[PDB]
């Protein structure tokens, strides 16, 4: 459209004969997401909900991506093994890690999902040491309304990284920032949603109440939904993972939607209040295999491509058969090397755009019991 | 520092023998501004307070910087004159506008202040028309903790512009975003501070309570101060300016600090509650000349370089003499072309860095009455 | 708690409430239990034996702030 072709009618709040007060008031009442954020970006964005995923980002590992090669890790493996708490399966193999990355990218491409690639500098470091955990791009997933700078609860190696990803999103995709978390802890990208307006968080090493309150207040305003619900799990774990039980600080390892009103869920996830809430709101629970969970094969860490279709770890044979039995298509992808650190396949995916999908009302209205 | 020289002692929360729980808790308790925002940026930043200004940005006008060249302005001058409410002083002259810009830059250089330059594209437009008001870079001033995306209450021509300035600050200076305002109206860069922890806002066309609450909550957490105060003026004005009275929607036209516990203030600014608050907190008021105020010569729009030294419009002879009588040095700078739109000299300056300066306690402790 | 607090013989009364992830009495996948007596117990003044499956973050914080020392039970046992 030509620079000299613009007219007052191109301003949505403008009307012939409108008073100053009325124009201003209409401006104050406009919706931020649809009036400002999306039009200025030139596109929709946000991974909220359980609708159709269209766009993601991955990181192709280099030798600097490997947590066990940080000089700080070398100084004290046991310090980082306490923070992470995941089973020791030996050193990360770079070549195999690269191969499973290619396989994940192909799964997306075979299903019509756009894949962007995020690179980091050589010898990447923040003020406190080498980057660590920066393969886990879910930590930079984009909300309706914009990107978030996180406060990491347990991993100093991620300082600077949510900044880098948000900046990448702005420069590469024109997606703006929504908020920085500035108190307590909050790692929103490791949260997930089980309906269009239902967020699952934890209280854990990765989330306190103050951080949660700040994040939820910001994303609720741009959620595109009338109401917003936060189901808060209360896992018994000290760091990231509890290898005695399968309990995890991140929702993405405890629970995930596989279809409308159907969740895959860890044995270690549901305290009584959470169970009651899910029951009352008509969610059907597919229980993950207990050994798969406890051994950190990440059977709940499935990525929903759309209701009824997920990407899952190829070696979660028992959980994946239960998911298929629930009428859901499973795309199996190798995820052996990724699980040597604090996450699985879903955890490594930055979700950029998901189309609007089924609501909590749709969950409540499904007749299945 | 070498990539392989990092040790655990480089992590501030680390200590020999610390448990996982204790390390995580120390991480949750760390201060965002000094642990994350500033170290990742590689520098301090923020214009908060009344200390020494060190760094600003200006825009050198082009033909597209002129509001009277927008096709929307041409379609209805009276619409925009209703929104703005400022006296008509005739057409902007590009070349003279450029000249007064160079004069302001020289004043900054003569006073030891670093000046960055912001350019816009040719034929710059947002989703709703040509940019308008984009010379006024105060709207992009940087807070302790980071940049802000604003919700403009009356000027659709600024949609997209606070985004552009924040992105510029991130790419050019490595300064991160703090928050996007997503409800109501809030134009924080046209606010000003009268002590290290005292923010002056208005309730007006440019600010509602919801927008104010969002902004104040965000900047208070990174203010670097134990307490934070918001003095809210209640000007009687419909749009930007009330040409019958001198009242303005923006604090920056109503009031400004000139020294520790000394303010220049418009006759039209102080409702009884605001006057009482200023009295109880020991602020001395220098009243701007009423004719200079009403004629929009912007006599309260002075830029504090440090306590006791301001830049002011060269033609505010009466107010400037009152400021000098109060023991403050005035640097007079031409600001004729800038005032044809909704702002004065201070309004066109993006403040990037101001050193920590006197506190509300310092104001309260000054003995002068 | 209202009933026993009035006859406790003590000026104050505190209830630490654990939130175990278990559907019935016992969770054989995790070691979590519906009963406190299987999750935690005092062994001396300010020293507790405690299950890996017992302590949510709020409970852990409360115990830490009140100076209780935790001996972790063997996870397989
Ligand atoms: Na719960
Ligand atoms: Na000032
Ligand atoms: Na508890």
mmCIF file of N, CA, C and O in Angstrom, chain A residues 207-238:
data_model
loop_
_atom_site.group_PDB
_atom_site.id
_atom_site.type_symbol
_atom_site.label_atom_id
_atom_site.label_comp_id
_atom_site.label_asym_id
_atom_site.label_seq_id
_atom_site.Cartn_x
_atom_site.Cartn_y
_atom_site.Cartn_z
ATOM 1 N N UNK A 207 10.056 -23.096 39.601
ATOM 2 C CA UNK A 207 8.911 -22.199 39.746
ATOM 3 C C UNK A 207 8.654 -21.898 41.221
ATOM 4 O O UNK A 207 8.409 -22.808 42.006
ATOM 5 N N UNK A 208 8.596 -20.620 41.572
ATOM 6 C CA UNK A 208 7.991 -20.218 42.827
ATOM 7 C C UNK A 208 6.697 -19.453 42.544
ATOM 8 O O UNK A 208 6.344 -19.190 41.381
ATOM 9 N N UNK A 209 5.974 -19.115 43.615
ATOM 10 C CA UNK A 209 4.663 -18.508 43.473
ATOM 11 C C UNK A 209 4.784 -17.104 42.869
ATOM 12 O O UNK A 209 3.976 -16.743 42.021
ATOM 13 N N UNK A 210 5.794 -16.337 43.280
ATOM 14 C CA UNK A 210 5.978 -14.970 42.795
ATOM 15 C C UNK A 210 6.285 -14.932 41.293
ATOM 16 O O UNK A 210 5.711 -14.129 40.546
ATOM 17 N N UNK A 211 7.200 -15.802 40.850
ATOM 18 C CA UNK A 211 7.481 -15.918 39.425
ATOM 19 C C UNK A 211 6.246 -16.361 38.648
ATOM 20 O O UNK A 211 5.939 -15.783 37.611
ATOM 21 N N UNK A 212 5.528 -17.361 39.180
ATOM 22 C CA UNK A 212 4.317 -17.866 38.537
ATOM 23 C C UNK A 212 3.307 -16.736 38.369
ATOM 24 O O UNK A 212 2.735 -16.581 37.285
ATOM 25 N N UNK A 213 3.078 -15.973 39.448
ATOM 26 C CA UNK A 213 2.071 -14.915 39.445
ATOM 27 C C UNK A 213 2.403 -13.870 38.373
ATOM 28 O O UNK A 213 1.522 -13.396 37.669
ATOM 29 N N UNK A 214 3.681 -13.519 38.249
ATOM 30 C CA UNK A 214 4.111 -12.541 37.249
ATOM 31 C C UNK A 214 3.873 -13.067 35.830
ATOM 32 O O UNK A 214 3.371 -12.344 34.968
ATOM 33 N N UNK A 215 4.242 -14.325 35.577
ATOM 34 C CA UNK A 215 4.104 -14.901 34.240
ATOM 35 C C UNK A 215 2.620 -15.002 33.882
ATOM 36 O O UNK A 215 2.220 -14.544 32.822
ATOM 37 N N UNK A 216 1.819 -15.570 34.792
ATOM 38 C CA UNK A 216 0.419 -15.839 34.519
ATOM 39 C C UNK A 216 -0.323 -14.526 34.292
ATOM 40 O O UNK A 216 -1.145 -14.438 33.383
ATOM 41 N N UNK A 217 -0.035 -13.494 35.089
ATOM 42 C CA UNK A 217 -0.668 -12.201 34.879
ATOM 43 C C UNK A 217 -0.387 -11.658 33.477
ATOM 44 O O UNK A 217 -1.300 -11.150 32.810
ATOM 45 N N UNK A 218 0.854 -11.792 32.991
ATOM 46 C CA UNK A 218 1.208 -11.254 31.677
ATOM 47 C C UNK A 218 0.535 -12.054 30.552
ATOM 48 O O UNK A 218 -0.090 -11.474 29.677
ATOM 49 N N UNK A 219 0.643 -13.390 30.561
ATOM 50 C CA UNK A 219 0.123 -14.181 29.452
ATOM 51 C C UNK A 219 -1.408 -14.229 29.432
ATOM 52 O O UNK A 219 -1.978 -14.377 28.351
ATOM 53 N N UNK A 220 -2.063 -14.073 30.597
ATOM 54 C CA UNK A 220 -3.521 -14.031 30.671
ATOM 55 C C UNK A 220 -4.092 -12.860 29.877
ATOM 56 O O UNK A 220 -5.159 -12.978 29.284
ATOM 57 N N UNK A 221 -3.404 -11.724 29.884
ATOM 58 C CA UNK A 221 -3.899 -10.537 29.198
ATOM 59 C C UNK A 221 -3.870 -10.680 27.672
ATOM 60 O O UNK A 221 -4.639 -10.024 26.989
ATOM 61 N N UNK A 222 -2.992 -11.528 27.132
ATOM 62 C CA UNK A 222 -2.868 -11.707 25.696
ATOM 63 C C UNK A 222 -3.257 -13.118 25.275
ATOM 64 O O UNK A 222 -2.932 -13.515 24.161
ATOM 65 N N UNK A 223 -3.997 -13.853 26.116
ATOM 66 C CA UNK A 223 -4.253 -15.268 25.872
ATOM 67 C C UNK A 223 -5.263 -15.465 24.742
ATOM 68 O O UNK A 223 -5.378 -16.565 24.223
ATOM 69 N N UNK A 224 -6.037 -14.417 24.439
ATOM 70 C CA UNK A 224 -7.097 -14.527 23.452
ATOM 71 C C UNK A 224 -8.324 -15.253 24.018
ATOM 72 O O UNK A 224 -9.162 -15.687 23.244
ATOM 73 N N UNK A 225 -8.410 -15.415 25.350
ATOM 74 C CA UNK A 225 -9.473 -16.186 25.970
ATOM 75 C C UNK A 225 -10.060 -15.357 27.105
ATOM 76 O O UNK A 225 -9.347 -14.567 27.726
ATOM 77 N N UNK A 226 -11.353 -15.582 27.379
ATOM 78 C CA UNK A 226 -12.083 -14.886 28.428
ATOM 79 C C UNK A 226 -11.563 -15.237 29.821
ATOM 80 O O UNK A 226 -11.514 -14.375 30.687
ATOM 81 N N UNK A 227 -11.298 -16.524 30.073
ATOM 82 C CA UNK A 227 -10.796 -16.972 31.360
ATOM 83 C C UNK A 227 -9.409 -17.579 31.149
ATOM 84 O O UNK A 227 -9.021 -17.906 30.026
ATOM 85 N N UNK A 228 -8.693 -17.771 32.260
ATOM 86 C CA UNK A 228 -7.391 -18.412 32.224
ATOM 87 C C UNK A 228 -7.225 -19.216 33.500
ATOM 88 O O UNK A 228 -7.505 -18.701 34.562
ATOM 89 N N UNK A 229 -6.833 -20.476 33.374
ATOM 90 C CA UNK A 229 -6.726 -21.385 34.506
ATOM 91 C C UNK A 229 -5.302 -21.889 34.631
ATOM 92 O O UNK A 229 -4.662 -22.191 33.635
ATOM 93 N N UNK A 230 -4.832 -21.978 35.869
ATOM 94 C CA UNK A 230 -3.514 -22.498 36.171
ATOM 95 C C UNK A 230 -3.683 -23.707 37.086
ATOM 96 O O UNK A 230 -4.035 -23.551 38.246
ATOM 97 N N UNK A 231 -3.429 -24.899 36.548
ATOM 98 C CA UNK A 231 -3.309 -26.104 37.353
ATOM 99 C C UNK A 231 -1.855 -26.216 37.812
ATOM 100 O O UNK A 231 -0.946 -26.313 36.985
ATOM 101 N N UNK A 232 -1.646 -26.173 39.127
ATOM 102 C CA UNK A 232 -0.318 -26.178 39.705
ATOM 103 C C UNK A 232 -0.014 -27.512 40.385
ATOM 104 O O UNK A 232 -0.592 -27.820 41.409
ATOM 105 N N UNK A 233 0.904 -28.297 39.822
ATOM 106 C CA UNK A 233 1.332 -29.562 40.413
ATOM 107 C C UNK A 233 2.359 -29.259 41.513
ATOM 108 O O UNK A 233 2.996 -28.190 41.516
ATOM 109 N N UNK A 234 2.559 -30.231 42.390
ATOM 110 C CA UNK A 234 3.401 -30.042 43.557
ATOM 111 C C UNK A 234 4.342 -31.239 43.682
ATOM 112 O O UNK A 234 4.199 -32.071 44.592
ATOM 113 N N UNK A 235 5.295 -31.414 42.731
ATOM 114 C CA UNK A 235 6.105 -32.629 42.704
ATOM 115 C C UNK A 235 7.092 -32.722 43.861
ATOM 116 O O UNK A 235 7.633 -31.716 44.301
ATOM 117 N N UNK A 236 7.345 -33.948 44.350
ATOM 118 C CA UNK A 236 8.340 -34.143 45.390
ATOM 119 C C UNK A 236 9.695 -34.431 44.748
ATOM 120 O O UNK A 236 10.067 -35.576 44.510
ATOM 121 N N UNK A 237 10.441 -33.363 44.478
ATOM 122 C CA UNK A 237 11.749 -33.434 43.865
ATOM 123 C C UNK A 237 12.565 -32.231 44.334
ATOM 124 O O UNK A 237 12.027 -31.135 44.496
ATOM 125 N N UNK A 238 13.873 -32.450 44.506
ATOM 126 C CA UNK A 238 14.759 -31.433 45.064
ATOM 127 C C UNK A 238 15.354 -30.566 43.953
ATOM 128 O O UNK A 238 15.311 -29.336 44.031
#
